[PDB]
Amino acid sequence: VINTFDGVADYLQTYHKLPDNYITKSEAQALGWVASKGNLADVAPGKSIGGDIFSNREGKLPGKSGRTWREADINYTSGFRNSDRILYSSDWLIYKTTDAYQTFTKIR
């Protein structure tokens, strides 16, 4: 039940488990999440999408000898998403972006 940059990072750097309130895009999409609808508050009155899997081959985020990269929605309540998004790696390195996946400022 968390949706804030530092809070999600802190949770991951401390508990390593994805904040009890996230779901992979696939799950969200398969659960019924539809673009031409934004249904979420109904089936999930306070849940944020996030927890997918990416290799970062495109090198858009910190890398090394094999790096794992994953993202998560941030600043959500009941309705649709926004531009606030947090990125976390295998090594738990966290970066924040508020322009809808555009600028990745580091936070942890």
From Swiss-Prot:
Residues at the active site: 71, 100
Protein name, entry field: Ribonuclease
Functional note: Hydrolyzes phosphodiester bonds in RNA, poly- and oligoribonucleotides resulting in 3'-nucleoside monophosphates via 2',3'-cyclophosphate intermediates.
Upper lineage: Bacteria, Bacillati, Bacillota, Bacilli, Bacillales
Broad class of the protein's primary localization: secreted
Known EC number: 3.1.27.-
Top-level taxon of origin: Bacteria
This protein's record includes keyword Hydrolase: yes
Residues of the full protein shown: 50 to 157 of 157
Listed GO CC annotations: extracellular region
Biotechnology: Introduced by genetic manipulation and expressed in male sterile maize and rape by Plant Genetic Systems and in radicchio rosso by Bejo Zaden. Barnase expressed in transgenic plants will specifically destroy the tissue(s) where it is expressed. After cell transformation, protein expression and plant regeneration, the active nuclease destroys the pollen producing organs thus rendering the plant sterile.
Location relative to the cell: Secreted
MF terms (GO), sorted A to Z: RNA binding; RNA endonuclease activity
The UniProt record lists the keyword Hydrolase: yes
Assigned protein family: Belongs to the ribonuclease N1/T1 family.
Keywords: Endonuclease, Genetically modified food, Hydrolase, Nuclease, Secreted, Signal
